[PDB]
Amino acid sequence: FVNQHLCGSHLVEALYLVCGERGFFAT
Amino acid sequence: FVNQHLCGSHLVEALYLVCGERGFFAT
Amino acid sequence: GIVEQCCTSICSLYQLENYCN
Amino acid sequence: GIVEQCCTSICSLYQLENYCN
């Protein structure tokens, strides 16, 4: 089906999305 | 930097992640 | 729809979430 | 850390979120 791992650059995007206003390391 | 678009199969994964128990079309 | 909002453009968490269930 | 939890394995939203801020 689809890959449910969030690696590397997809991990960065997932964080961008879920962290929102309060941000994340290392943006 | 990183791509902030969620297309196709990355869109499916983002939904998997955020929708959780109550699911989504078209899983 | 979701493609326009989340793929062609950039969507938030909250927007994405009204596409759940 | 996040790589083990979210890349090598599969993580939830809630788990992912303790890696914010």
UniProtKB/Swiss-Prot annotation, chains A, B:
Looking at the UniProt entry, the stretches that span the membrane are none
Instruction: Give the recorded effect for H10D.
Output: In HPRI; Providence
**Listed name of the protein:** Insulin B chain
This protein's species is Homo sapiens (Human)
From Swiss-Prot, chains C, D:
Coiled-coil annotation reads none
Q: Which domain of life is it from?
A: Eukaryota
Q: List the disulfide bonds.
A: C6-C11
The name this protein carries in UniProt is Insulin A chain
Species source reads Homo sapiens (Human)
Native organism taxonomy: Eukaryota, Metazoa, Chordata, Craniata, Vertebrata
Where in the full protein does the shown chain start and end, and how long is the full protein? 90 to 110 of 110
